[PDB]
Amino acid sequence: DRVLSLPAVSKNQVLENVFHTAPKAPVEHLEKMVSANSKVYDALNLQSKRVLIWQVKPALF
């Protein structure tokens, strides 16, 4: 019964209690806000090819 003197908690159960959650990448905040601010650029810039300024305030000609 030498196995009953070994630590009963497995090496697996250490690696799933220490590494419980997949950690958040540093770059996943950049490349997720950048793709969402690229829609703020598109709609709201005045130099974009798809501005909403002629759709929401139609021009007086």
Partner: protein
């Protein structure tokens, strides 16, 4: 150095920026009538686009704008009829010489604002001596063409046109206002009809007195 199309591009870049105020959009409109810019419609469109966006409006910039809209012959009902919001809030703040330009421009465009012309006729009969004869005709042109059949003003204007004889252009505006009201008062049409052989300078007021006489069916002059 006398640059008229190069000053249109300098006016175009004044009203194409982001935070044009009332005074900068008044004077852009005033400069487009003195320059007689009927050919460029988009430049007149950029001015009335900023004229709806402009939020503060003192007494002098509202009447300079409304003069320029009326004199320039530019009409956009949405822009001009929402300029009656500044006017009913600046109405005790307005000069008697300035209230004639507001009500003539808002009336001549057809702005259906009964709160404006009720308060702007009650002012012009509370101070009837304070208004020169050209100003009582401009208010009368406005209240008539704004859809108000105010005969209280048309009597008080008729007592002024009998006491003092008026200019030719002053009378023909007053005839045109009484023609739309459909009044045909012999006491006041003939008091305004004597102003038309001292020499008239425009043909627009000879043609409008022509229209106003025939619509009331008086006879030619």
């Amino acid at each position: 150095e006398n640059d008229v199309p190069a000053i249109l591009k300098e006016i175009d870049s004044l009203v194409s920026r982001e935070a044009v105020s009332a005074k900068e959009v008044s004077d852009a409109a005033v400069a487009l009538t003195y320059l007689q810019v009927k050919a460029n419609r988009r430049l007149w469109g950029k001015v009335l686009e900023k004229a709806g966006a402009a939020q503060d409006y003192d007494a002098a910039s509202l009447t300079n704008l409304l003069w320029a809209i009326n004199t320039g012959g530019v009409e956009h009902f949405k822009t001009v009829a929402e300029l009656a919001g500044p006017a009913v809030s600046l109405l005790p703040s307005l000069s008697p010489v300035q209230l004639s330009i507001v009500v003539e421009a808002l009336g001549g465009a057809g702005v259906k604002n009964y709160e404006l012309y009720n308060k702007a006729s009650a002012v012009v009969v509370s101070k009837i001596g304070e208004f020169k004869p050209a100003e009582i005709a401009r208010v009368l042109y406005g209240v008539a063409f704004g859809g108000v059949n105010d005969v209280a003003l048309a009597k008080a204007a008729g007592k002024v046109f009998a006491s003092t004889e008026v200019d030719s252009r002053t009378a023909a505006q007053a005839l045109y206002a009484l023609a739309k009201l459909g009044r045909a008062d012999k006491a006041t049409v003939d008091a305004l009809l004597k102003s038309f052989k001292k020499g008239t300078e425009s043909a627009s007021d000879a043609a409008a007195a022509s229209f106003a006489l025939g619509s009331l069916s008086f006879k030619a002059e």
